[PDB]
Design an enzyme around this catalytic site. Structure first.
Site, PDB file in Angstrom:
ATOM      1  N   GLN A  33       5.493   4.020   1.218  1.00  0.00           N
ATOM      2  CA  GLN A  33       6.280   5.397   1.636  1.00  0.00           C
ATOM      3  C   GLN A  33       6.947   5.312   3.042  1.00  0.00           C
ATOM      4  O   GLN A  33       8.057   5.828   3.171  1.00  0.00           O
ATOM      5  CB  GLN A  33       5.143   6.509   1.525  1.00  0.00           C
ATOM      6  CG  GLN A  33       4.679   6.824   0.378  1.00  0.00           C
ATOM      7  CD  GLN A  33       5.875   7.243  -0.489  1.00  0.00           C
ATOM      8  OE1 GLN A  33       7.109   7.187   0.295  1.00  0.00           O
ATOM      9  NE2 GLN A  33       6.051   7.674  -1.820  1.00  0.00           N
ATOM     10  N   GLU A  50      13.152 -13.033  19.453  1.00  0.00           N
ATOM     11  CA  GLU A  50      13.192 -12.708  20.784  1.00  0.00           C
ATOM     12  C   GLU A  50      12.493 -11.747  21.102  1.00  0.00           C
ATOM     13  O   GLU A  50      11.868 -11.739  22.104  1.00  0.00           O
ATOM     14  CB  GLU A  50      14.660 -12.094  21.270  1.00  0.00           C
ATOM     15  CG  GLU A  50      15.130 -12.057  22.566  1.00  0.00           C
ATOM     16  CD  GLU A  50      16.448 -11.767  22.761  1.00  0.00           C
ATOM     17  OE1 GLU A  50      17.316 -11.924  21.826  1.00  0.00           O
ATOM     18  OE2 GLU A  50      16.931 -11.237  23.932  1.00  0.00           O
ATOM     19  N   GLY A  71       0.845  -1.021   0.119  1.00  0.00           N
ATOM     20  CA  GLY A  71       0.135  -0.015   0.177  1.00  0.00           C
ATOM     21  C   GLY A  71       0.822   1.252   0.061  1.00  0.00           C
ATOM     22  O   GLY A  71       1.986   1.155   0.343  1.00  0.00           O
ATOM     23  N   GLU A 106      -1.704  -0.054  -7.532  1.00  0.00           N
ATOM     24  CA  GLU A 106      -1.765   1.241  -8.372  1.00  0.00           C
ATOM     25  C   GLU A 106      -0.476   1.351  -8.636  1.00  0.00           C
ATOM     26  O   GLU A 106       0.545   1.924  -7.970  1.00  0.00           O
ATOM     27  CB  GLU A 106      -2.534   2.372  -7.767  1.00  0.00           C
ATOM     28  CG  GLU A 106      -2.102   3.650  -8.671  1.00  0.00           C
ATOM     29  CD  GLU A 106      -2.361   4.156  -9.926  1.00  0.00           C
ATOM     30  OE1 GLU A 106      -3.509   3.923 -10.246  1.00  0.00           O
ATOM     31  OE2 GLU A 106      -1.384   4.450 -10.291  1.00  0.00           O
ATOM     32  N   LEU A 146      14.674 -10.707  16.481  1.00  0.00           N
ATOM     33  CA  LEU A 146      13.415 -10.179  16.248  1.00  0.00           C
ATOM     34  C   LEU A 146      12.588 -11.395  16.654  1.00  0.00           C
ATOM     35  O   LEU A 146      11.527 -11.197  17.289  1.00  0.00           O
ATOM     36  CB  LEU A 146      13.167 -10.305  14.839  1.00  0.00           C
ATOM     37  CG  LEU A 146      13.625  -9.103  14.147  1.00  0.00           C
ATOM     38  CD1 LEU A 146      13.704  -9.228  12.593  1.00  0.00           C
ATOM     39  CD2 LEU A 146      12.905  -7.660  14.643  1.00  0.00           C
ATOM     40  N   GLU A 184     -13.546   3.160   6.724  1.00  0.00           N
ATOM     41  CA  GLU A 184     -12.162   2.550   7.305  1.00  0.00           C
ATOM     42  C   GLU A 184     -12.688   1.773   8.564  1.00  0.00           C
ATOM     43  O   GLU A 184     -12.003   0.627   8.807  1.00  0.00           O
ATOM     44  CB  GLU A 184     -11.562   3.776   7.918  1.00  0.00           C
ATOM     45  CG  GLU A 184     -10.350   3.295   8.760  1.00  0.00           C
ATOM     46  CD  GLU A 184      -9.561   4.481   8.802  1.00  0.00           C
ATOM     47  OE1 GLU A 184      -9.926   5.486   8.923  1.00  0.00           O
ATOM     48  OE2 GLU A 184      -8.287   4.341   8.724  1.00  0.00           O
TER      49      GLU A 184
HETATM   50  N1  LIG Z   1       2.264   7.658   8.592  1.00  0.00           N
HETATM   51  C1  LIG Z   1       1.534   7.740   7.460  1.00  0.00           C
HETATM   52  N2  LIG Z   1       0.582   7.508   7.293  1.00  0.00           N
HETATM   53  C2  LIG Z   1      -0.190   7.373   5.902  1.00  0.00           C
HETATM   54  C3  LIG Z   1       0.732   7.688   4.886  1.00  0.00           C
HETATM   55  N3  LIG Z   1       0.034   7.836   3.609  1.00  0.00           N
HETATM   56  C4  LIG Z   1      -1.203   7.420   4.044  1.00  0.00           C
HETATM   57  N4  LIG Z   1      -1.343   7.186   5.274  1.00  0.00           N
HETATM   58  C5  LIG Z   1      -2.396   6.804   6.275  1.00  0.00           C
HETATM   59  O1  LIG Z   1      -2.961   5.798   5.845  1.00  0.00           O
HETATM   60  C6  LIG Z   1      -4.399   5.904   5.370  1.00  0.00           C
HETATM   61  C7  LIG Z   1      -4.623   6.146   3.679  1.00  0.00           C
HETATM   62  O2  LIG Z   1      -4.491   4.719   3.257  1.00  0.00           O
HETATM   63  P1  LIG Z   1      -4.633   5.167   1.485  1.00  0.00           P
HETATM   64  O3  LIG Z   1      -3.638   5.888   0.984  1.00  0.00           O
HETATM   65  O4  LIG Z   1      -6.112   5.560   1.342  1.00  0.00           O
HETATM   66  O5  LIG Z   1      -4.705   3.771   1.021  1.00  0.00           O
HETATM   67  P2  LIG Z   1      -3.906   2.274   0.782  1.00  0.00           P
HETATM   68  O6  LIG Z   1      -4.076   1.644   2.032  1.00  0.00           O
HETATM   69  O7  LIG Z   1      -2.629   2.820   0.243  1.00  0.00           O
HETATM   70  O8  LIG Z   1      -4.614   1.436  -0.456  1.00  0.00           O
HETATM   71  P3  LIG Z   1      -5.603   1.572  -1.373  1.00  0.00           P
HETATM   72  O9  LIG Z   1      -6.948   2.200  -0.331  1.00  0.00           O
HETATM   73  O10 LIG Z   1      -6.188   0.739  -2.262  1.00  0.00           O
HETATM   74  O11 LIG Z   1      -5.262   2.930  -2.209  1.00  0.00           O
HETATM   75  C8  LIG Z   1      -5.104   7.024   5.933  1.00  0.00           C
HETATM   76  O12 LIG Z   1      -5.398   6.808   7.515  1.00  0.00           O
HETATM   77  C9  LIG Z   1      -3.706   7.856   5.790  1.00  0.00           C
HETATM   78  O13 LIG Z   1      -3.634   9.054   7.119  1.00  0.00           O
HETATM   79  C10 LIG Z   1       2.113   7.999   5.089  1.00  0.00           C
HETATM   80  O14 LIG Z   1       2.977   8.006   4.055  1.00  0.00           O
HETATM   81  N5  LIG Z   1       2.537   7.735   6.325  1.00  0.00           N
END
Ligand SMILES: Nc1nc2c(ncn2[C@@H]2O[C@H](COP(=O)(O)OP(=O)(O)OP(=O)(O)O)[C@@H](O)[C@H]2O)c(=O)[nH]1
Ligand SMILES: Nc1nc2c(ncn2[C@@H]2O[C@H](COP(=O)(O)OP(=O)(O)OP(=O)(O)O)[C@@H](O)[C@H]2O)c(=O)[nH]1
Ligand SMILES: Nc1nc2c(ncn2[C@@H]2O[C@H](COP(=O)(O)OP(=O)(O)O)[C@@H](O)[C@H]2O)c(=O)[nH]1
Ligand SMILES: Nc1nc2c(ncn2[C@@H]2O[C@H](COP(=O)(O)OP(=O)(O)O)[C@@H](O)[C@H]2O)c(=O)[nH]1
Ligand SMILES: [Mg+2]
Ligand SMILES: [Mg+2]
Lengths: 428, 426, 426, 428
Positions: free
Chosen positions: A14, A243, A9, A60, A241, A172
């Site tokens: 990221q 552990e 995801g 994606e 890990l 969610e």
């Molecule tokens: N810490 C952090 N939270 C993130 C990041 N990107 C998204 N989130 C959080 O993760 C959730 C978003 O999920 P999405 O980006 O909508 O979806 P995905 O889980 O990548 O998968 P899809 O719904 O199929 O696109 C939200 O609650 C965001 O606040 C990030 O880079 N860092």
């Protein structure tokens, strides 16, 4: 002695980007893989290039493309970068079933390929988010297969905890409830953090009122590195890990240790202030540095693990522990004596060039399992309930083959989980 | 006449790293393996701990055991890791994770067969073994878990050799593993009846000594394990070197064990004070005896004056008069008669060696067997019970097949040692 | 007094490439053929393996046989391929293809006549032959197929000479030819009763040793065949050089064969450990005996303690006391009495040579005849049966005229050796 | 120690073009034959020119003319380049009988001339395609004569396996059925590959979505060179062609070992990745690198041969074998123990300048006889049946003298062949 990272995801990937960047920073790894110098995570080529043993999954193309066009595109093997064409749409029904289930076989075979590259697979960990389609949907799908093939390996999950106040995903609750149902039963341990709580950390300890995810994930990366890089590096108490799992999971349910991290200090805040091991650990028991918005004082502790970087002398740690055991208001559950895992690495804490955190000479990561987590579930319970009572958005799952009973069931499983927390809270 | 030593667990491996260092110091053996000393005695009794390999290389008669190559590697990387032969590094891959069940009951069990084979190879290399010594932690997975398994098999093979072990006892304040008392409980259950004697080391007490009398503000485990090795090395050198009294380990064991089951020891050490005061200290036998008796110089977090003393051994290193030693020990017995047990006349026994530890004029090792030891068992047993009722982390253990009734019996056995100390506390 | 050696098959040719290299090392003979040594002994008994040709050229008394010029060429291309005379290269054209039928029964049979003629020419060149030795693989076409044919004719011509052979025995894991057990079965059928003795070499075991004790991560067949040649050369040098004990190959054969049909051997070798440990090794007779007895130092994938030992030969090279050797062998007999056969009192025999292998102070060759050997036969026989029923590749063999009833009898004969080992296993 | 290559039909010749190009690449042979440096395949002139011992047959001038106008026109002897004027028209009836039978005598006499040039003819191999007129028609005609004259020499055939999905020849089933009938009985072993499967290899391992035959034949050439150049070159285990036959053909029927080849890797895929012998052989048992579209997991193995190039240590091979024997799901037929031929050449793997495959340091070719081949026959059975039931296109054969009974018969022979596979599948 090897392990696999799995990034599913956007959130998973990221965050992973920050993680692998940090591992490069840990050893001086060049974007092309050239390392002049940690083979537990990396696989070596004859050119001295090392490949991070990890799998990147996105249904994606875009995020993986972001990787593919960045500097670390040379680092990652093209087969590690797996992408589909279409999304899950925030929806377990497609993520776990309809869409993600088509590609997963490929994904698994790349994993298996890496498992065959491993000589001593210790285990793995999965980075995702509790609310998204692939973030949680696909993720649990993967666990369903990985727990078969790698049943005896570490199955640690890391997930973003849905912020109680801000969420971009209207279903969610539904996604997370379904994941509970399927992850509880398959995974070994799931960790989570709250971006809202993190924002508060950024604004209070880093003094930053403009956090982006690229900041937020650096902080997460810090925590992760403490338990991934430094646990493979040398120390006094070298903790593995496995552990970790063996020292953090008390019951066969899951458990969900939450992260806390101290030091999180801006450069200016580091000036004029001397931290000791004990002082840092004092900060670790403060609500203020709690990475999830859940009050530590509300619940009772069940588990706690403290992992140390840099200039830490066990002598000082011992004294610190004595005071946290006796000075604090930390209530703990009967079941547990205070056997808190102390990991002590000589490996110093590292800082991202151009980051927000100050160079520190020592650092402490805290994992903790508190009964207050049931309140987090309570939040989900009502959010789910509201939607489900109205049956809002239900057609987006039903049309993919989901059952209403199933959703009820998943809620009930959550309720059972809450009840088990209740149970633990009852001291005995 | 010879001894084999086996180290296990991260603790045991790091303690042994200092132990062997010291032994080679004692004999003038270089970190690379050859002998470059300068005393006749240095080579004369070297046999107890070293095999001389071709080229005037000395091989420490010990096995290094772990389930993670990295710890072993770190040991190997320092001086004296080169003196050990590769064949003494026996290790697996994937930890234990501080899990008794893995260590003893299941996975670590698998490795033990290869360890034992090497043990056998060394038992053949010796002319005549006096015994074996193992270094480990009581609450650790490989330290206690796997280590215990090994002990039960070695004892089986050699009933007639001394089986002792030194072990880190969970300090009241710093436990690392949540089930550290569980592992310890299980090790009592297994060890006590499968060993001739065990020593109780408390890190907390050690940290107090290092600041309390040594006034140090930077120790690490290597500095505290130095103190540990001082006591370990103190014991065996006398056996090795010429003295006055009775310098045999077995005889020590005989004099210190009044009852088949109560063989737990409280080590202490003298002289042991900061350099500042060294300009204000006098070196006499009473001086050493003052430091030896004082509970604060004990390495075990016990209090001998709380309990009763069953047996006391006073080992001396360096030139001392027999008279003075006799008289001061008598005085101790006299003045602390309220702590000694009335059943044993003249409960303080001595041993005297004429070789001082390198750099000192004199030194003494305190070994005691008091009833006070039971307090440690009580602390563990209690903590255990609480965990037992909740099964904390027992899914990890029961997941690997450890049965709760075995644990139940282990609990009893702990309580049995306490009751027997009470039976002789009177 | 002299020996003729014949190599066959790609295996045999490459093994011999190392064997002869070593023999010339032993005597200081240059890769080009002349003698440039430096010891009296080096020339003194050279006759057993070399003919001195005019110009102080030494010709190895051996025939290189194959059915593909290219392998022969590769042998010839290296050092020591120049020492062999062209007349010792006997080969055809078109393989065998690892086909017994071709090798033995048909095509290779054609070449054998030219081979034998050269053999005869060499038998005349010798003053007095002690025997012959052949190197080959049991599952190979020319190695076993053609080689066997040759053996039956040589034995016929010289009943009174020693006929032995060393052969690569199909390892459980790495067979190359699908019918490798078939070829092996047929070779047992032919060889066992047409040889005085055969040695069992397992490449798998060899690969374990090279990493297990030698800790090597790059061997090739040349490195493993070095180990093979160490055992082969070990045997004959003693016969060649001055010693203490009884240094005759025939006498070895006499002492190792209790029964006309059970003459299979398990070679082993000591010392045989990595350089790291060489700084931690001691060189004593018990040291060699420890390495010799240990099954892991066997070159055959057997386990002597599983079976019973019928005969043991311990050959020593270098200066050793007679006492020490006698005592340690006795000790072995004593401690491993549970593996030895009760019918043979003092089943461990020795031979002692005073010349050490170049570069070592001492060395020992282990030769055993256990019942454990039967396990290899059992594995082959079983695999054979399955193939037999299906006729896998037997159209190739039956296409060349090999009859299935001959194979049937071969199967029986394998089973007969197993039953006879059982008959003396008791 | 000599052998003859025979290239019949376009497929045979164009593949041959790649093959001889590769042999030139193996030794640095100039287009004019000048070689500065493998006489098992080549015949030497006093100028140091070497002639590839091969025969090129095409009944249509064009392809041979392509040779005649290319760079290798100087390499080939004009007598090796044999051409007719008219085609077989996709049709056995003309290829084997009416047309090709006229020229074959010439062809044979050139072959015999080369056989007389050979001093130690080990054997030969024929390159063709199962569906074409000359590709299969003429080919079997040749075998009919070669098996008389060279009855004891190696008769290895290599043919393109008709793609189940794409075929340009409507009567290919009919052609292939007739060849079965006549080749089974004459040939010793026939190998085949599927261009469709190869396309999948090109797009997945080479990452190429534009394969032409000139790419496809390079890959084939790789496989062929492993068994032709490197088997004559030095190694540890030098395996001959007769040995191949003696180690690959288990029954007097034919058998049809299929090719699999791993490494097939793009340059970028080679980066960041370290192959071992064992890893390459792992790839060899993956369906993914199977050169014929037929599922390895469906059938049972009967034969398997692994041939190694470059940096291969038997030590590693042994370990690899142990794991393929025990780790995999490879079911095998009772009859066979796992005596898999291991050929180990020191001769390194070679790469075509300007090709798609990455420079590799070691390589493994796999031949295998699996029971799944009967499904391939089943495909042909129905395709034939459909046409034959309607009698579509039948007049194009009948007019050349073919008999309907004959066609039925040939199908039945195929059915018998399938039945024998059935038999082998029954374990015993
Ligand atoms: N810490 C952090 N939270 C993130 C990041 N990107 C998204 N989130 C959080 O993760 C959730 C978003 O999920 P999405 O980006 O909508 O979806 P995905 O889980 O990548 O998968 P899809 O719904 O199929 O696109 C939200 O609650 C965001 O606040 C990030 O880079 N860092
Ligand atoms: N791999 C490969 N397959 C080819 C090549 N050329 C043709 N084919 C395949 O072989 C078959 C084509 O045979 P044709 O070219 O029609 O005929 P031919 O066998 O040369 O003989 P004629 O029918 O008389 O022209 C088809 O199945 C093609 O897919 C080539 O260069 N490489
Ligand atoms: N004195 C001392 N104690 C140690 C050392 N290392 C770990 N310990 C103690 O050992 C306990 C932890 O067990 P550990 O050795 O990690 O177990 P294992 O490695 O899984 O066998 C804690 O009580 C530590 O204080 C050391 O080097 N010296
Ligand atoms: N030790 C050893 N074994 C070999 C060598 N060459 C082939 N082998 C073994 O011999 C068997 C194959 O037979 P091979 O020698 O090719 O038969 P031939 O050449 O047709 O007579 C396999 O079991 C190989 O492991 C070698 O140089 N050394
Ligand atoms: Mg997304
Ligand atoms: Mg054409």
């Amino acid at each position: 002695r090897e392990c696999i990272s799995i990034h599913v995801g956007q959130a998973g990937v990221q965050i992973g980007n920050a993680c692998w960047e940090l591992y490069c920073l840990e050893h001086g790894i060049q974007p092309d893989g050239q390392m002049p110098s940690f083979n537990t995570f990396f696989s070596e080529t004859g050119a001295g290039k090392h490949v991070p043993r990890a799998v990147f999954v996105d249904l994606e193309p875009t995020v993986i493309d972001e990787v593919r066009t960045g500097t670390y595109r040379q680092l990652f093997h093209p087969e590690q970068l797996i992408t589909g064409k279409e999304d899950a749409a925030n929806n377990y029904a497609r993520g776990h079933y309809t869409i993600g289930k088509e590609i997963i076989d490929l994904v698994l075979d790349r994993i298996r390929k890496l498992a065959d590259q491993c000589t001593g697979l210790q285990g793995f960990s999965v980075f995702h988010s509790f609310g998204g389609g692939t973030g949680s949907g696909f993720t649990s799908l993967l666990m369903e297969r990985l727990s078969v093939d790698y049943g005896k390996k570490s199955k640690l999950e890391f997930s973003i905890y849905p912020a109680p106040q801000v969420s971009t995903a209207v279903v969610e609750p539904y996604n997370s409830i379904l994941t509970t149902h399927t992850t509880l039963e398959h995974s070994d341990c799931a960790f989570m953090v709250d971006n809202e709580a993190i924002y508060d950390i950024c604004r209070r300890n880093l003094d930053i009122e403009r956090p982006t995810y690229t900041n937020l994930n650096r902080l997460i990366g810090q925590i992760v590195s403490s338990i991934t890089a430094s646990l493979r590096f040398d120390g006094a108490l070298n903790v593995d890990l496995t552990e970790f799992q063996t020292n953090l999971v008390p019951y066969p349910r899951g458990h969900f240790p939450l992260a806390t991290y101290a030091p999180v200090i801006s450069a200016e805040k580091a000036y004029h202030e001397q931290l000791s091991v004990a002082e840092i650990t004092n900060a670790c028991f403060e609500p203020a540095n709690q990475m999830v918005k859940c009050d530590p004082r509300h619940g009772k502790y069940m588990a706690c693990c403290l992992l140390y970087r840099g200039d830490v002398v066990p002598k000082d740690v011992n004294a610190a522990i004595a005071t946290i055991k006796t000075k604090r208001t930390i209530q703990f559950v009967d079941w547990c004596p205070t056997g808190f895992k102390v990991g002590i690495n000589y490996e110093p804490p590292t800082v991202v060039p151009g980051g927000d955190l100050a160079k520190v000479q020592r650092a402490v990561c805290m994992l903790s399992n508190t009964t207050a987590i049931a309140e987090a579930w309570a939040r989900l319970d009502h959010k789910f309930d509201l939607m489900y009572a109205k049956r809002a958005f239900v057609h987006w799952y039903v049309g993919e083959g989901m059952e209403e009973g199933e959703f009820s069931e998943a809620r009930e499983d959550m309720a059972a989980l809450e009840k088990d927390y209740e149970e633990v809270g009852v001291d005995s | 006449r010879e001894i084999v030593h086996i180290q296990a667990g991260q603790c045991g491996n790091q303690i042994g790293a200092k132990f062997w260092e010291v032994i080679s110091d004692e004999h003038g053996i270089d970190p690379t393996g050859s002998y470059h000393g300068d005393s006749d005695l240095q080579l004369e009794r070297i046999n107890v701990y070293y095999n001389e390999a071709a080229g005037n290389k000395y091989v420490p008669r010990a096995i290094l055991v772990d389930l993670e190559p990295g710890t072993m590697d770190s040991v190997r990387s320092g001086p004296f890791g080169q003196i050990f032969r590769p064949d003494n590094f026996v290790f697996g891959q994937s930890g234990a994770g501080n899990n008794w069940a893995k260590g003893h009951y299941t996975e670590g069990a698998e490795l033990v067969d290869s360890v034992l084979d090497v043990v056998r190879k060394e038992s053949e290399s010796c002319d005549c073994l006096q015994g074996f010594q193992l270094t480990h932690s009581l609450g650790g997975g490989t330290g206690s878990g796997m280590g215990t398994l090994l002990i039960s098999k070695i004892r089986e093979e050699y009933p007639d050799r001394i089986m002792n072990t030194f072990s880190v006892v969970p300090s009241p304040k710093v436990s690392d593993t949540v089930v550290e008392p569980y592992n310890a409980t299980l090790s009592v259950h297994q060890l006590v009846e499968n060993t001739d004697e065990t020593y109780c080391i408390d890190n907390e007490a050690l940290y107090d000594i290092c600041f309390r009398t040594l006034k140090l503000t930077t120790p690490t485990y290597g500095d505290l394990n130095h103190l540990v090795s001082a006591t370990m090395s103190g014991v065996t050198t006398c056996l090795r070197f010429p003295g006055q009294l009775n310098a045999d380990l077995r005889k020590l064991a005989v004099n210190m064990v009044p009852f088949p089951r109560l063989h737990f020891f409280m080590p202490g050490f003298a002289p042991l004070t900061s350099r500042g005061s060294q300009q204000y200290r006098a070196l006499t036998v009473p001086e050493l005896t003052q430091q030896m008796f004082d509970a604060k110089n004990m390495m075990a977090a016990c209090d001998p004056r709380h309990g009763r003393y069953l047996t006391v051994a006073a080992v001396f290193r360096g030139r001392m008069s027999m008279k003075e030693v006799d008289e001061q020990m008598l005085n101790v017995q006299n003045k602390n008669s309220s702590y000694f047990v009335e059943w044993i006349p003249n409960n303080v026994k001595t041993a005297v060696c004429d070789i001082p530890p390198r750099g000192l004029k004199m030194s003494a090792t305190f070994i005691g067997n008091s009833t006070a030891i039971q307090e440690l068992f009580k602390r563990i047993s209690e903590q255990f019970t609480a965990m037992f009722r909740r099964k904390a982390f027992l899914h990890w253990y029961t997941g690997e097949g450890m049965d709760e009734m075995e644990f139940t019996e282990a609990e009893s056995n702990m309580n049995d040692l306490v009751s027997e100390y009470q039976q002789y506390q009177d």
